[PDB]
Amino acid sequence: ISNCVADYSVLYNSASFSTFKCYGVSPTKLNDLCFTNVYADSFVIRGDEVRQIAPGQTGKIADYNYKLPDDFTGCVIAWNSNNLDSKGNYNYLYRL
Amino acid sequence: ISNCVADYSVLYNSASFSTFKCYGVSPTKLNDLCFTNVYADSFVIRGDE
């Protein structure tokens, strides 16, 4: 994500997100800062392992699939997609 | 629970558990320690308690 003007308030002032966790920063401050080396990461996990997407977590998602560092700076956003990804559906794989 | 070798990694690296909260210790360290006076307690409660 680069060379843009990003308005962050329309993200957390919306309805669908049941997780908006920021780490090195407060959400109220995001519209006042300028950012460097912005990246965005996207996947689908099970419903009861959203808690593993955090600094310092154990479990087969955090240990085998996607690891966050301890000194992480950024935000973790998650929302329910039952209407879009359930029927049967089997081509969402995870490493075991 | 006594006189045995416990592999703790297959507990939290499994899928069914929706709560794995350790208190005096970290889960990553459990396979490196030896334990004293191990007991296990089991019941069924309601969903929101």
- Decide if A63 touches B, using CB distance below 8 A: yes
Element (H, E) at A19: strand A19-22
- Decide if B18 touches A, using CB distance below 8 A: yes
Question: Which of A52, A58, A63, A95 should one mutate to test binding to chain B, selecting the residue with the greatest count of B CBs within 10 A?
Answer: A58
Q: CA–CA separation, A94 vs A50, rounded Å?
A: 14
Question: Which method was it determined by?
Answer: cryo-EM
Angle at A50 between CA B27 and CA A65, to 5 degrees: 70
CB contact (8 A) between residue A59 and residue B13: yes
Q: Transcribe B11-44 into DSSP letters.
A: HHTSSS-S----SSS-GGGGGG---SS-------
Q: What is the resolution of this structure in A?
A: 2.4
Q: CA–CA separation, B36 vs A54, rounded Å?
A: 31
Q: Give which of A50, A38, A41, A46 is closest to A3, Cα–Cα.
A: A38
